[PDB]
Swiss-Prot record, chain B:
UniProt name for this protein: DNA ligase 3
Residue ranges of the TM segments: none
Subunit structure as annotated in this protein's UniProt entry: Isoform 3 interacts (via BRCT domain) with the nuclear DNA-repair protein XRCC1. Interacts with POLG. Interacts with POLB.
Coiled-coil residues: none
Family to which this protein belongs: Belongs to the ATP-dependent DNA ligase family.
Gene behind the chain: LIG3
Disease tied to this protein: Mitochondrial DNA depletion syndrome 20, MNGIE type: An autosomal recessive mitochondrial disorder characterized by severe gut dysmotility, muscle weakness and atrophy, neurological abnormalities including epilepsy, migraine, stroke-like episodes, learning difficulties or cognitive decline, and neurogenic bladder. Brain imaging usually shows diffuse leukoencephalopathy and may show cerebellar atrophy. Disease onset can range from infancy to the teenage years.
Domain BRCT: 2-77
Function in brief: Isoform 3 functions as a heterodimer with DNA-repair protein XRCC1 in the nucleus and can correct defective DNA strand-break repair and sister chromatid exchange following treatment with ionizing radiation and alkylating agents. Isoform 1 is targeted to mitochondria, where it functions as a DNA ligase in mitochondrial base-excision DNA repair.
Domain free text: The PARP-type zinc finger is required for DNA ligase activity.
Tissues and organs where the protein is expressed, per its UniProt entry: Testis, thymus, prostate and heart.
Length: 95, 77
């Protein structure tokens, strides 16, 4: 009987993740009823990255104002506390 | 831990024609399952539905997936 606190939320995993982190993120987002996208689009609500901010982030922002850029630790800790934690705690911003 | 590692190491092709496909897939993947994509279908450890093609895999059932997750381990087909 699985929790559903990612339901309705569209995720895109951008870039390369270490080891099996990509598989783990897929597992957790799916488990909590998140919808993972094969491609970026203005329907994506959360980009999960380990990489740093690059101009394509800003380009995606100008086309989707509510988009948020978050680190994989958000997903991990959401699993650990079994709750929807505020993604702002793990955000990616320009460097 | 709520998400137990049950289907670790198993590669299952889940055809989209399967009833209750989305929930079945969600729970299977949530408990460490590994879905195989269509073109990579012939090389998979289990098949859900029928042994055609890839009879080298092992046939199981959605009932099998649910029974595995409720017994909290792997089990007979």
């Amino acid at each position: 009987e699985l929790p559903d606190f990612f339901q309705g939320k569209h995720f895109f995993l951008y870039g390369e993740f270490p080891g099996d982190e990509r598989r783990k993120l897929i597992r957790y987002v799916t488990a909590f009823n998140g919808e993972l996208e094969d491609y970026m689009s203005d329907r994506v609500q959360f980009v999960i990255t380990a990489q740093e901010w690059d101009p394509s982030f800003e380009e995606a922002l100008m086309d989707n104002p509510s988009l948020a850029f978050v680190r994989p630790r958000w997903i991990y800790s959401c699993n650990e506390k079994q709750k929807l934690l505020p993604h702002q705690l793990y955000g990616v911003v320009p460097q | 831990k709520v998400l137990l590692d049950i289907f670790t190491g198993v590669r299952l092709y889940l055809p989209p024609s399967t009833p209750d496909f989305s929930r079945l897939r969600r729970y299977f993947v949530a408990f460490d399952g590994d879905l195989v994509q269509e073109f990579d279908m012939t090389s998979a450890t289990h098949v859900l539905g029928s042994r055609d093609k890839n009879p080298a895999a092992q046939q199981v059932s959605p009932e099998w997936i649910w029974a595995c997750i409720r017994k909290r381990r792997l089990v007979a087909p």
